[PDB]
Assembly symmetry: C3
Homo-oligomer: 273 residues x 3
């Protein structure tokens, strides 16, 4: 791919709020334009070094939270990270909780998801003539999931070690009836809007992708229903802990994901017809 400036490469992608990026840590940061066949990524990708590991930061909503979940150019974002050479992708996300023990301020490292989106326009990179059906039974990268859990537990933070993420379309939040389906019918644990098709595309790109979720709310279930103000406030209250985990995990990603704990790392070997 063409990049400007030319020649830029990276090894770990970080997708999340622009507040995760700390200019006090990242060595030799550069804003990079990475061409894609899908147009612009959400914002500049900031590439720089953390403990000698080259990181590409990409705020999925753009700086300033300009781009709501349904409007994100997921294809461009994942294509650009892959084009840079990344092997690992850490997503950081705000989620609602469907269970009392997943409390606001707790981290969750989900292991499963249920896609209830509808309007994301492209759920794949492969529209033909090579038909590709990736296996996503185990859709996250187990290597990276375990690294995230370990980091949180070493830092003394609550990090729930599993969870099913229901991805809804939004931007409006769930009705009570919908939330009861998510909680009591689907038996899901957390809820968000951005996982899908991000994760699909990451898998197809043979990336080791995992989500570090932060519970920001209990959806409809507490005294007052979730609001955007609530989500943003709680996220910003907890962003420093998310940064501590990121900067703890990244230095340990200098190597490669373990193939036998990376469901997608050879996804295309058996997926393409």
């Amino acid at each position: 791919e063409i990049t400007r400036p030319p020649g830029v490469r990276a090894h770990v992608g970080v997708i999340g709020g622009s507040g995760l990026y700390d200019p006090g840590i990242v060595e030799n940061p550069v804003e990079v334009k990475v061409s894609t066949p899908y147009g612009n990524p959400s914002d500049f990708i900031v590439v720089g070094d953390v403990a000698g590991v080259k990181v590409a930061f990409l705020p999925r909503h753009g700086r300033g939270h300009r781009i709501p979940p349904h409007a994100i150019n997921y294809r461009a974002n994942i294509w650009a990270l892959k084009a840079l050479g990344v092997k690992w992708v850490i997503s950081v996300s705000a989620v609602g909780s469907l269970r009392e023990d997943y409390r606001p301020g707790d981290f969750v490292v989900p292991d499963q998801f249920i896609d209830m989106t509808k309007n994301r326009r492209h759920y794949t990179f492969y529209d033909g003539p090579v038909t590709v059906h990736v296996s996503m039974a185990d859709p996250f990268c187990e290597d990276l999931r375990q690294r995230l859990i370990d980091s949180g537990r070493r830092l003394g933070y609550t990090v729930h070690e599993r969870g099913t993420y229901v991805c809804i379309e939004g931007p409006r939040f769930s009705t009570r009836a919908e939330s009861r389906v998510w909680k009591d019918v689907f038996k899901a644990d957390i809820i968000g809007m951005t996982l899908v098709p991000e994760i699909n595309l990451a898998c197809e790109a043979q990336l080791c992708y995992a989500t570090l979720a932060m519970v920001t709310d209990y959806d409809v279930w507490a005294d007052r229903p979730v609001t955007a103000e609530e989500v943003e406030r709680v996220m910003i209250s907890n962003v420093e802990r998310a940064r501590r985990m990121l900067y703890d995990v990244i230095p340990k990603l200098a190597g490669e994901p373990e193939l036998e704990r990376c469901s997608c790392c050879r996804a295309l070997d058996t997926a393409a017809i």
Copy 2:
């Protein structure tokens, strides 16, 4: 917004079949073109007075039922009503029933919904750069719901005082397997095709929106499955009762929705980032 004729305003919107509009009641009716950034509303909006309350009538399918649910320009419709100044929106809708006691000819004033649509292309007005996530835990306007229930009970009509509306994509009707999911898995009460994204957009526009549903059929559950002919016949058989309720409720809407019984009336106060 530009209107033709210029200067037109209204206080209550009525969305439903064009047969709800009664030229024998509405004073000084005018067909109005309201510019929108989304193109044409379903039809002309007819503005006129009912007991001194200014009403804007908008047939969501167009006159003659020209526009099926998936083809409606929901954004244009709601933008136009908001641009006219409306505070209240009464939707009148035909629905199927998933429960024996919600009989054809009965009114239902739903309180919840489950969105099973997929192809409506825009589920919001807010695509950036201001990200908006409205709370829709309680998606209808309680003030108006209670007014509709009261009117029906004063007229002597059956009006079920709650219900979960499952909105399906259509235009084809549900399979038996789908209907069993709606009824037995989701525990929904009624089924229709037009609620979503109408309601989402109304909430984002800070309107007090409520649905007066008329049960027209039992979906798959009676001896013969629902047909369009059946829906239309039963609706037209009952339209006069729907008109009686409309013309009973509207005169009492000269004032404002009660903020504490209007979940969406200040939706943007905590929804925008």
Copy 3:
């Protein structure tokens, strides 16, 4: 419709893999271009005779499996078959199983479906001004279903005589959490990606459409999750049996579907407003 070569007609459509077409059987085969208002069908339609019945073969993925499920021009495919004059449509499909007794290599003739797609862009031919809502309580053509079951049982093959097909969006395969919803919550039997909106459009076109499914895998439920390689291998291992059933059934379709066992054959009589 214009066709090239001109004047081509057919009585039975066959939709499935191009490997179903046997040049050793089909008399006087011709590749036909059938104009549609939706652009190109997936590939040429090959028209020829089987035991004096005129068949139109249409590989939904194209020759070479060029077109994944979400990219198929369903409208063009069904319009073209209808334009040729077909009355019957046999779909042949690979499916996953959600139940141990529906084993790889077994045929299934589903009777129901649950549409979990989202990105197919058009779910109907009718976008106005004639609004059409077809009844699909019983979405397959019972006449043809029973013919397929009979053929399999006469050939000595396992053919499950009912089933609920959950149609997912793809192209990625289901997560374990999703598969548990399909199996344990929706109580579905098989899973695929191509049924919808094919079946909707066939019903609207007043065709007698039925699916001959071949189980190729157990989705997430066996020791290793489904892969595309697995599906393709098992399908190609079993294609000859599918051909035997096709060439056994087709000669018996010289006449018309029985109206009282064809839910869609007069669909438009009560569907159009």
